[PDB]
RNA sequence: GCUCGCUGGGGAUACUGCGGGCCUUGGGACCGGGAGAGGCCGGGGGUACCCCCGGGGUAGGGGUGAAAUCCUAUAAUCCCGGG
């Protein structure tokens, strides 16, 4: 169908957010803009507004190299880490709708871990 | 009356003790269909996490109330194929 889909991966956290939009097997890199790249204070990374800034960038790079529809893959850190996206996913989804792309199945792809390892902090946490 | 008692004899067998006899209620033994993260041994898996290699890709990544230390051009973070 000569129809160019690709698909957008999404790391949220609770510290910063990446993009990274990539063809549909995901082996090659189409484009990549951080949280971190396009705000200087660190206090405004995990910002949604910074996300979106992000993804608009993002997204700019896919349709000058020819992509038209995305699929969502957004996912938090996992593992022993948070579960729980971070607020710029649903900025960042929206900056990608905004700019222009069709968007196709939206999944997340959190790594869950059947009783794996020892999180970090100890047993009594985090005392702040 | 007291010396908290000792001793020679006679009488009773309700209770306790002792010897004997018969019972199943307590507790054990055994059969029947089932319940359970009860234990030990052997085999097979689950994602997740860490390290290494091969491909893509550039400049940040991580972290905090905010920062800094730290990793990153000897190609980091991130995505993919393998050990």
């Known amino acids: 169908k000569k129809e160019k889909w ?3 991966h999404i790391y949220s956290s609770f510290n910063n957010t990446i993009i990274h939009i990539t063809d549909i097997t995901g082996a090659e890199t189409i484009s990549r803009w951080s949280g ?5 204070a ?3 990374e995990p910002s949604p507004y910074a996300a979106m800034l992000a ?3 993002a997204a700019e790079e896919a349709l000058e190299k020819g992509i038209v529809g995305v699929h969502i893959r957004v996912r938090a850190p996992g593992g022993s880490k948070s579960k729980t996206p971070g607020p710029g ?3 960042a ?3 990608l709708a905004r ?5 196709g199945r939206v999944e997340d792809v959190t790594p869950i871990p059947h009783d794996g390892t ?3 902090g100890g047993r009594r946490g985090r005392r702040v």
């Open 99 to 103: 700019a222009g792309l069709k968007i």
């Open 89 to 91: 996913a649903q900025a």
């Open 36 to 40: 971190g790249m396009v705000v200087k």
């Open 6 to 8: 690709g698909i957008a």
């Open 42 to 44: 660190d206090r405004d």
């Open 93 to 95: 989804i929206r900056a």
């Open 118 to 120: 020892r999180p970090k």
């Open 55 to 57: 993804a608009r960038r």
